């Protein structure tokens, strides 16, 4: 549902067609991790929720470069999943 | 601009069909 633990408790036949497969999960807590050495970010998911295209519009007797909202012509097929990378520290900062 | 010509021809054909069906010579 919202968290991964609840999502793993459902079956595939129970999720088909609902639209939950295109959603991104939710996390609960406020702690700290601190990556050791040889860590890897695994299972990254990115879900957009708003789109805009740069254009030229007229506000009042003037024209400016403004981002106008757009509607998705396709369907729920726009979420990225399964991204993996390798973490490291350079000077106290994390690099993906 | 030829879309106007196409639409006019099709609507004219439909008008002809309407008049043929509803304003017809009595078979008697």
């Amino acid at each position: 549902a919202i968290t991964k633990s609840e999502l793993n408790q459902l079956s595939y036949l129970q999720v088909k067609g609902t639209g939950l497969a295109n959603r991104c999960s939710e996390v609960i807590g406020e702690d700290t991790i601190t990556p050791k050495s040889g860590a890897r970010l695994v299972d990254m998911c990115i879900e957009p929720k708003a789109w805009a295209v740069e254009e030229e519009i007229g506000k009042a007797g003037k024209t400016e470069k403004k981002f106008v909202n757009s509607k998705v012509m396709t369907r729920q097929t726009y979420t990225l999943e399964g991204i993996e990378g390798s973490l490291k520290t350079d000077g106290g900062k994390i690099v993906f | 601009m030829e879309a106007l010509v196409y639409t006019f021809l099709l609507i004219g054909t439909l008008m002809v069909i309407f008049f043929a069906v509803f304003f017809r010579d009595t078979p008697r």
């Binding site: 509607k71 396709t74 | 879309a3 196409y6």
Partner: protein
């Protein structure tokens, strides 16, 4: 007299200009909505992504099409056989982008034609006739249903149905011949014989009946004016037509009974169309026509070609070029 009784009396009345009946209650709204949607879509619809590869195709007059090239594009390949009503889309623009109107038009239209058949039977019953005209009408309905619904069901996607346009049918026929080798299925041969024989018999009947007209006008009056609505005259002065047909060909072949003649006239094309519709429906499940590729070989073992091999070469040429960007793997299953 109750209100319902008066309504029933009006609905099944024979005094109306156009009979309504109870099948009309289904025929009229469906056909009217299909007609309205078809006209609006054919005039002013935006391009539709038919192959599911984000490559939309234009089909409306306002987007640079003429009458010959315009069409209503089938739904997207990504949808498949899924039901796609208007209320299941996030917006009307998305509905138009994925080929929404095709499903609406075809479904309401098929319901309309079935109700048309029922209405034909109903008026026949109310007038005191014999109830078998709609059986004859069932053949075009069978063919249209076969294509529009049965082919997508077998192939698994609405995007394989026949487009509602003039060149769309040509595309449909060419791809169908490439993939299923029609023209070698005996049912298609039966259909071709049906249409050719129907035209031949129609011409023969018209010529024979028109030649045997009795003289009642003289010169300055069209011969059609001699017949009166209600006149009693059997539809052929026999001696003339009977002798003509007995002398033209082998004499023992001559239909001297009108009932049998008209029954044969009704029977031939209807049976032909039934057989060809069933052929299309069966080929929808990949039971193709005869295959005679590389069937004649010499003593050594080399292949000697026939005309079937030339047909096969044409089929290969059609096959390798259709839906160029849609396939990723060697077999077109």
């Amino acid at each position: 007299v109750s209100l319902w009784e008066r309504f029933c009396a009006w609905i099944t009345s024979t005094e109306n200009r156009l009979y309504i009946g109870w099948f009309g209650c289904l025929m009229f709204p469906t056909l009217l909505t299909a007609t309205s949607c078809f006209i609006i879509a054919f005039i002013a619809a935006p391009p539709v992504d038919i192959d599911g590869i984000r490559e939309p195709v234009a089909g409306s007059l306002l987007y640079g099409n003429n009458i010959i090239s315009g069409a209503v594009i089938p739904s997207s390949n990504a949808i498949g056989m899924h039901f796609y009503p208007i209320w299941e889309a996030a917006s009307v623009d998305e509905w138009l982008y994925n080929g929404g109107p095709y499903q609406l038009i075809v479904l309401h239209f098929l319901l309309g034609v079935a109700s048309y058949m029922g209405r034909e039977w109903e008026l026949s019953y109310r007038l005191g006739m014999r109830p078998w005209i709609f059986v004859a009408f069932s053949a075009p309905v069978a063919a249209a249903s076969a294509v529009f619904l049965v082919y997508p069901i077998g192939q698994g996607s609405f995007s394989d149905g026949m487009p509602l346009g003039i060149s769309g049918t040509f595309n449909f026929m060419l791809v169908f011949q490439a993939e299923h080798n029609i023209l070698m299925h005996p049912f298609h041969m039966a259909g071709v014989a049906g249409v050719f024989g129907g035209s031949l018999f129609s011409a023969m009947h018209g010529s024979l009946v028109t030649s045997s007209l009795i003289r009642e006008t003289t010169e300055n009056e069209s011969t059609n004016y001699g017949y009166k609505f209600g006149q009693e005259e059997e539809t052929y002065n026999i001696v003339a037509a009977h002798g003509y047909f007995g002398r033209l060909i082998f004499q023992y072949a001559s239909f001297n009974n009108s009932r049998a003649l008209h029954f044969f006239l009704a029977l031939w094309p209807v049976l032909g169309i039934w057989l060809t519709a069933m052929g299309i429906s069966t080929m929808a499940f990949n039971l193709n026509g005869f295959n005679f590729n590389q069937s004649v070989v010499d003593s050594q073992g080399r292949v000697i070609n026939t005309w079937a091999d030339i047909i096969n070469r044409a089929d290969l040429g059609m096959e390798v070029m259709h839906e160029r960007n849609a396939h990723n793997f060697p077999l077109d299953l």
